[PDB]
Write a protein that binds this DNA or RNA. Sequence first.
DNA 1: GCGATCACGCACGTC
DNA 2: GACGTACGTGATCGCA
Length: 580
Amino acid sequence: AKMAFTLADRVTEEMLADKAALVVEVVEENYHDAPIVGIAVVNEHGRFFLRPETALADPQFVAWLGDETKKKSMFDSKRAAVALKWKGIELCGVSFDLLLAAYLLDPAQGVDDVAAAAKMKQYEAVRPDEAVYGKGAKRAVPDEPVLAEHLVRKAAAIWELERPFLDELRRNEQDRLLVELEQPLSSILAEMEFAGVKVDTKRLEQMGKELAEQLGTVEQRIYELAGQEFNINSPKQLGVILFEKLQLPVLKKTKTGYSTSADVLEKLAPYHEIVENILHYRQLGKLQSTYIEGLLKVVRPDTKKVHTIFNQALTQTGRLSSTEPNLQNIPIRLEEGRKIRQAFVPSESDWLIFAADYSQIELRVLAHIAEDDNLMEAFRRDLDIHTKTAMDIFQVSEDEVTPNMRRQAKAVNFGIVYGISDYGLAQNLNISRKEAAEFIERYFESFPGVKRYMENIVQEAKQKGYVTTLLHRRRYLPDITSRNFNVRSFAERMAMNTPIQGSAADIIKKAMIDLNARLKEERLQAHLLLQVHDELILEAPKEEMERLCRLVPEVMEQAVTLRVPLKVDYHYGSTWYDAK
DNA sequence: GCGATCACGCACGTC
DNA sequence: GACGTACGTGATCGCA
Ligand SMILES: OC[C@H]1O[C@@](CO)(O[C@H]2O[C@H](CO)[C@@H](O)[C@H](O)[C@H]2O)[C@@H](O)[C@@H]1O
Ligand SMILES: OC[C@H]1O[C@@](CO)(O[C@H]2O[C@H](CO)[C@@H](O)[C@H](O)[C@H]2O)[C@@H](O)[C@@H]1O
Ligand SMILES: [Mg+2]
């Protein structure tokens, strides 16, 4: 049965009530400078559809959008807020975001439209967006009657579902997590995305040119060494060259053929000079295709900025992700790739990039949650944690810790945080399962509080059905009761890891909210550009650097109070590369 | 049948 | 442990 609404030709006062469900529809996946295709409002007075050209040109409607005392409930308010920012319109007063509510209640549902959220509460009187707009290439905005009914049904669902969602959040003790953390964060991310990051495209193009020259040389050397020409980028052609023509050992298999992962190739390098060249080719080609060509494709040519979109409602642990471009995986480990960061520059003359990162936040969170006396003392002394771990597991003095010992202890520390397993550690360190098991046993002997946490958290996951983070984010783990060893073991590792990774995510999100409040109080021009899981990147006038050196680390260190200190390192410079 | 698209396995970049 | 993008390849679709 059809849903009744007014297809309005002009904005009226009853559309401007002080509580409403609002839909401001942006169909393009990337909403930056994208069209708004229609607007729906549902409130005490009825249901309304407005054409955007009309509504967004109407002073009363625009004033209503920007009035913080006029409360709106929405789904994915950041998309609307950013699309409106590109049109110079402020959206304020969003008091409920159904996307973030659904995400907090259960991130595993993968809710990404109103219909998916609605089905959580047995409400089905709204179509999935994919049904209305189609998917992929065939995607398209439908004719007005179809569009208007869809937007009004979405607004009506939001209007109905706010109360039951808030009720369930309150039962879970997650209502403050929504209202005081995720919703305010959404506004901060909207500002970050809209500001964008300035790119030195000439520098990127120069790099592109160098890389292409190097790739040509290496490509030709590979042909020479192979005694043949082939698609180095093909798994089938390369496999025939390495494991048939050149007879290299097959040390590892993939589902459907020969593994050629770098870890495998590293092992084969002693047998034939072609291998080191394939590795080099892959290094350069990744930089060329993903970073140089990829970034240049998405830079806006007018302003030379890139505008990422942070997906706030995707990861199972409460981290953000970043897309189009992903600015959370710009190279840093190897110097050649690291130079890519020289192309990320401040957006104004005489400004600088300032970067601040937490030192070992996940192990500090683990020390806190596990109340492990040895680990807490280590951080209270601000020790090098990997050297301390080596001292304990290998039973030696600090002087006797060799580089290889520190390297292996570091890998153990990562294993412990990720959800230790003897097979996984063995693969990482390239040792036997028995040997890896001995490393883990020694670790738990030195850190018995961590051992107790790991046992207890798996038991809690089984008993309650989920694990929780410091600020009450939850992750359900139904596979924890599986009678399949591999399925169950993966869930156990999630039970161990999620409260650590997720609590670290909670802390940095709170730090962002606190930082923006402090920046506004101090009336600094500095602002956030990016978050990369445990680090915040800002730009500001050079004259603000001294103040930021004190202000940013303090805010990040004081965001929460743990049983150990939090420690933040910081650097600044004329490009992201130099903020090291 | 011939591009256009979709789907998936794979490899590799970050924290 | 958590992500996103690029690529090659084979399948499928879209329309005659
Ligand atoms: O707008 C972000 C918000 O939208 C969702 C879908 O509800 O993701 C869409 O937007 C993305 C960013 O452009 C795409 O990466 C994604 O493919 C698209 O479905 C949410 O998942 C997200 O939180
Ligand atoms: O032997 C106990 C030890 O095994 C683990 C897995 O490493 O859990 C297993 O043992 C349980 C009972 O004590 C089950 O509840 C669990 O499902 C099973 O996998 C550890 O958590 C536990 O300490
Ligand atoms: Mg760090």
